[PDB]
Design a protein around this ligand. Sequence first.
Ligand SMILES: Nc1ncnc2c1ncn2[C@@H]1O[C@H](COP(=O)(O)OP(=O)(O)OP(=O)(O)O)[C@@H](O)[C@H]1O
Ligand SMILES: Nc1ncnc2c1ncn2[C@@H]1O[C@H](COP(=O)(O)OP(=O)(O)OP(=O)(O)O)[C@@H](O)[C@H]1O
Ligand SMILES: O=C([O-])C(=O)[O-]
Ligand SMILES: O=C([O-])C(=O)[O-]
Ligand SMILES: [K+]
Ligand SMILES: [K+]
Ligand SMILES: [Mg+2]
Ligand SMILES: [Mg+2]
Ligand SMILES: [Mg+2]
Ligand SMILES: [Mg+2]
Lengths: 491, 491
Amino acid sequence: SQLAHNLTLSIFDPVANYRAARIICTIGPSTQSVEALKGLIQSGMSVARMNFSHGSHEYHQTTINNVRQAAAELGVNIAIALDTKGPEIRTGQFVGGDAVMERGATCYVTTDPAFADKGTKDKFYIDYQNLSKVVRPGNYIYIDDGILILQVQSHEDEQTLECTVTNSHTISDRRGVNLPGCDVDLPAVSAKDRVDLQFGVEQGVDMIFASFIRSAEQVGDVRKALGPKGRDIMIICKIENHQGVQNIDSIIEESDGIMVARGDLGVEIPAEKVVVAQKILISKCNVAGKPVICATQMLESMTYNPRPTRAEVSDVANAVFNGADCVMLSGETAKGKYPNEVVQYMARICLEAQSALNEYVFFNSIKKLQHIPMSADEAVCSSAVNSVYETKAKAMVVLSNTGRSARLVAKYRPNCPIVCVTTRLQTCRQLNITQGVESVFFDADKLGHDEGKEHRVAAGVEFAKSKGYVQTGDYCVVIHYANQTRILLVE
Amino acid sequence: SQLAHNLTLSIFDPVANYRAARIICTIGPSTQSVEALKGLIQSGMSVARMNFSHGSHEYHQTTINNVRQAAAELGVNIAIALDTKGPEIRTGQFVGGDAVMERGATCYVTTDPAFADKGTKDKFYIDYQNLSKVVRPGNYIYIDDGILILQVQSHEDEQTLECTVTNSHTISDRRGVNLPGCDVDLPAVSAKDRVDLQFGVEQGVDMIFASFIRSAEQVGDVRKALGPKGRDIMIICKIENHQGVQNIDSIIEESDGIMVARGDLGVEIPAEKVVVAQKILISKCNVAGKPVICATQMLESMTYNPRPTRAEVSDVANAVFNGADCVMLSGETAKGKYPNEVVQYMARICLEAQSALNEYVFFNSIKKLQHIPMSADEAVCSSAVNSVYETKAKAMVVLSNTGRSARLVAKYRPNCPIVCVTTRLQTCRQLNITQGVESVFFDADKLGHDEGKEHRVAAGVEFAKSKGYVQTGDYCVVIHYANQTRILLVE
Ligand SMILES: Nc1ncnc2c1ncn2[C@@H]1O[C@H](COP(=O)(O)OP(=O)(O)OP(=O)(O)O)[C@@H](O)[C@H]1O
Ligand SMILES: Nc1ncnc2c1ncn2[C@@H]1O[C@H](COP(=O)(O)OP(=O)(O)OP(=O)(O)O)[C@@H](O)[C@H]1O
Ligand SMILES: O=C([O-])C(=O)[O-]
Ligand SMILES: O=C([O-])C(=O)[O-]
Ligand SMILES: [K+]
Ligand SMILES: [K+]
Ligand SMILES: [Mg+2]
Ligand SMILES: [Mg+2]
Ligand SMILES: [Mg+2]
Ligand SMILES: [Mg+2]
């Protein structure tokens, strides 16, 4: 039982020689330079997220050009993700890049597209036109992931509302406004996004973090909007509203993965239930084998201090325990004072949680919840991981070009690193979001086709030998769709 | 649980398309002819046992020559086993081939080597010389697997005892006499046996059923006596005395397999404890992977009637449930009136027990009791059977020349037939004692070495296709020591 395994732990227990959980960071003013991006990569960042709710196509271009440059200079594959705007509502900019709203103070929310560029604590912009008709005196307006709340007192015209500010808090530019239960009709796939998405395909982003997904049909609209040029790009659905959670089943089916975007969720649903939701999504992904990302406010206080609170630590670790493939840093790196220290601490908390975990349980639990009869190749991965546990193999080698086989292995949670040998360089970046995998690029255009698998398999084992996973005389399990599995001794 | 699985059963449930348990018969006057031996092979006999406690080397020769002839004419591999005399004590022959001892009647047991050829109900021979010194008035003498008991009244000379016969019963020639607790010193490996064993090596017997094994050292004495010429012959230790059971651990280690010879055991230990012993031996073999045979009086009443009692049925089935690889017929075929009917009924009871069993439990139970870390090749077989269960594969193909890999697979109890492809014809016979395996002879001297494994693997699948195990589009798992495993679709 879980209680029995807790008794066997010790603070002194040596950490694993590899990290499994994958870190994702958000690139902002604090982290756009190559000299900072290199910092994040060495500190533990696997994926760079670009939030398209801020900055121009001119800005994100620079992010892309610098992420890639910092990667090549360090000799690693780092993935780039586009995060769509979606059917959100955003405030407008402010004079001084921010506003300081105080408890008791009164403010003005206009829908005048000329209060976009200028924003006081007294008056600012909200980019939903119909706003005046959606609200009544008494109803709240939530600013910034449910932190700041304004109570509506009255109208002023057919554009502006008088609003009591109920709590003190500083807001910067373009904070998300959230209206709970207001049936707020907004383009399931907005015009701004079709623009944003096609830019992603052209520059060659590795994955799309689709915001505010609510239905299966909605995901199709995204992939259809990506065009035939971007069929290879992954679609990670951000579950952050009431219905998205209720329709999780069918969304997972269409999607390539899930993000528990807790910021918006923690407003749209009663905050205590966010916890239940987390569990549900994560585990449901674990069963399917589609990577899951936990995100938002996990290390919030490290935007200011150099050390997280005991709650914040708890969160990161407990998330890894819940089965999250990926943990993600938002404002913590985008505008934080400690962008390297925040990544290091997360990588370290991840190791600790992962070492004090029993992966063997995860393996059996997942296997139990699989529909017998399994497919040909899924059984192979299953059993080949069952092989790892019985043999205490210190590494695994999988040959997947598309990436499927690699993930399908990681699905069954082995207690060793999974080395994935692929000929396609994109697959290496796209695997930076599935847990406990490392990718090795086998250059097809200068080392030959190798339909004998001989040179590739031995390349993966060399990577294992170099990273110090296996020595001379340790066991390594090798799979290659993949329908053949072998256990070999290493020289 | 076991109780839960019992509720899911039904008398109407269709039987498996293959039998797993292996039948072994004893060749006697009823079954020595080729026209009868063919009968036994078609009725379900896998192995022919020769009991060397009866008949000359001239007699057993004929058995060998006819078993082999009946095999070749039917086109199957049937194994031949030698069953040693051991440190036993046997009565002497009788005028009329038998004696009828009645309750109340008085009899004479002489140790005169001239009452060997003539034997009355009044007087016969017992081939232990020291007998007169081992017994006292009051002590019993057990004749014929503990059926007939004589109470010693007095001496008559320095050769003969006066004995009350306490129960009525007919005994034929050379019934085994058993003396409980009498520390009876007898050559651990007797002179008669070294003669018998060397005859086995010359004619080329497939396995030795070593009688009355009591220690590890004792098994060595057998293999050492077999010489370097018979290193390939298997040594099945017959546990049938007090110490043999107590030293089971170390005996298993040295031996190639165990037989629970219950006849002699049921005298040497308190008959109710035979049941506990059975369980212990069998399960201990199951854990090691060394085949176990259950034997003696399993279908006794079918030496006379054409239908077994409800106890006798119970026994055969319950034995298969206990985990026995092999069930063996002794007097039932050797001198029975229904030698074909007795084999058919056993094959049928075996199917029924085997169909109403959950092999999946056996698989997990055995796997649990394996020392982690497993060997390279043992994990492969383990996981490759784990593959069979998840994929509902209807057959398995293993390439083992020596036979080890084949057995090591059968160790983990899959729910399908195991087709074993071997180049050596002996291995086919020697596999006739491990459960749920069928052997296919791949002729090495007229079909080539085939170090690519291609032609052999496809030969095993053809056997599966011919026996109607797999159709077009079913799953078959293929292993080849064996350190590579594949799951393939069939054409
Ligand atoms: N490209 C950027 N330029 C300027 N500021 C940014 C940028 N990306 C993030 N930020 C700052 O970091 C904060 C949080 O970043 P994050 O990517 O989590 O977006 P968010 O506002 O929380 O919206 P979402 O709900 O999509 O996460 C933003 O409010 C913003 O002030
Ligand atoms: N080759 C044979 N020739 C004649 N009779 C035989 C032969 N084999 C077996 N029998 C008869 O069958 C009976 C039982 O056969 P079985 O092989 O079980 O030997 P057993 O006497 O029970 O000794 P063991 O304890 O070795 O089994 C014998 O008592 C004997 O009468
Ligand atoms: O969209 C998000 O990432 C959130 O709301 O946290
Ligand atoms: O030796 C035997 O086979 C017995 O005693 O049953
Ligand atoms: K967004
Ligand atoms: K014997
Ligand atoms: Mg959002
Ligand atoms: Mg956020
Ligand atoms: Mg015996
Ligand atoms: Mg017997």
